[PDB]
Every structure is written in structure tokens, then in C-alpha cells.
Design a protein around this ligand. Structure first.
Ligand code: GDP
Ligand code: 0QW
Ligand code: MG
Length: 166
């Protein structure tokens, strides 16, 4: 019955839709439509306290649109996703974290850094570099695989814990 507005951010192709779908529907969709943006609602129990999740899975190319800024205003927590095999996607995290801190006007915005596709063999972003970035932000870092399910509940639930702590 308390509702959390969550926003899933990160470059195209990192797995934002595969994570969100895995969480909601419990399976891995290979090659989900790259171009669709929507919210998904789910009722979950975390640490024994029921809540409603309202999760925006962002899509589209954007030089910073007004509609995106409106959704960032509404967001209560941000899941910032990169892919461990994609150096550019990791480089983009800086930029998301700047926008988030600007829109919310705050250094202390509930956020979790998510390194997705942890099942993949050719890792290009070092775990230690992500851990260090996360630690410098003071936010949790969780490696996930939307394909394996590894980490998926933990990423979203930890973001909820971050809202609740805050
Ligand atoms: N191996 C693997 N592939 C994934 C994973 N997550 C997403 N993908 C694939 O990577 C591509 C991008 O996923 P998508 O969910 O569309 O990412 P989005 O653009 O951020 O929404 C698709 O081909 C997915 O099947 C994962 O955890 N492991
Ligand atoms: O549903 C949401 C979840 C997080 C942030 C914003 C929203 C809103 S109000 N949206 C309106 C329709 C698509 C997303
Ligand atoms: Mg998508």
C-alpha cells in the first residue's frame, strides 16, 4: 500500500527491459523491443513489508526531453544500469547520476548501480571500478543477469531499501 515510483535508467542495450520483465513476469526475453517505453506495476513484499512498485523502463534517444525530466522528477529511486561487456554504457553512468542530482536538487537520491549481463564471458568493465564508483557515490552496487535471474530481485529490493532508509 505505500507505492514507490522507480525509474530504470542506462544506455540502450544494457538490459533495462530484460531486468524489468524478469522482475515482473519471471522470465528472460531475448531482444525485447528496444524502442518501447512503459511503466510496470508489481506488488511485492520486501523485508516483510508489502509495497507497490511502479517501475518506468526508459527507452528512446534523448537530448534531455521535457517528458523525461518530468518522469525523473517523479522517480523516488533510480536503478542505473550498465552492461559489464560495454565500456560506453559504464561511461554513461556519470551522466545519469548528474541528471538525477540536478532534477532532484540533491546529493542524496536513493540509487543503486547495476552491472548487468553478469553471465557473459567477455567482461570489459572491471568489478572493482564499478564498486569504487558506487562507493564514491555512497550507493549500493549489485551485479545482475536478467538471463540467469542472478541478482534481479536484489537490485530492485535494495533500491526500495534505499528509499526506506532515506
Ligand atoms: N546475456 C545476457 N543478455 C542480456 C541480458 N540482459 C539483456 N540482454 C540482451 O541484451 C540486449 C538488450 O536488452 P534490453 O533489455 O532490450 O536492454 P535495454 O535496451 O536497456 O532495454 C537484448 O538482446 C537482450 O536479450 C543478460 O543479463 N544477459
Ligand atoms: O509510472 C512512473 C514511474 C516512475 C516515474 C514516472 C512514472 C510515470 S508518472 N509515468 C507516466 C506513464 C509512463 C511513466
Ligand atoms: Mg528497453
Amino acid at each position: 500500500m505505500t507505492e514507490y515510483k522507480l525509474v530504470v535508467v542506462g544506455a540502450g542495450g544494457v538490459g533495462k527491459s530484460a531486468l524489468t520483465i524478469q522482475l515482473i513476469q519471471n522470465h528472460f526475453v531475448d531482444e525485447y523491443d528496444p524502442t518501447i517505453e512503459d511503466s510496470y506495476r508489481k506488488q511485492v513484499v520486501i523485508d516483510g513489508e508489502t509495497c507497490l512498485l511502479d517501475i518506468l523502463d526508459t527507452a528512446g534517444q534523448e537530448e534531455y526531453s521535457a517528458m523525461r525530466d518530468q518522469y525523473m522528477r517523479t522517480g523516488e529511486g533510480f536503478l542505473c544500469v550498465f552492461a559489464i561487456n560495454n565500456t560506453k554504457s559504464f561511461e554513461d553512468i556519470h551522466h545519469y547520476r548528474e541528471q538525477i542530482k540536478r532534477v532532484k536538487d540533491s546529493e542524496d537520491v536513493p540509487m543503486v548501480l547495476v552491472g548487468n549481463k553478469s553471465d557473459l564471458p567477455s567482461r570489459t568493465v572491471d568489478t572493482k571500478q564499478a564498486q569504487d564508483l558506487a562507493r564514491s557515490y555512497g550507493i549500493p552496487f549489485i551485479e545482475t543477469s536478467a538471463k540467469t535471474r542472478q541478482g534481479v530481485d536484489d537490485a530492485f529490493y535494495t533500491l526500495v531499501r534505499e528509499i526506506r532508509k532515506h
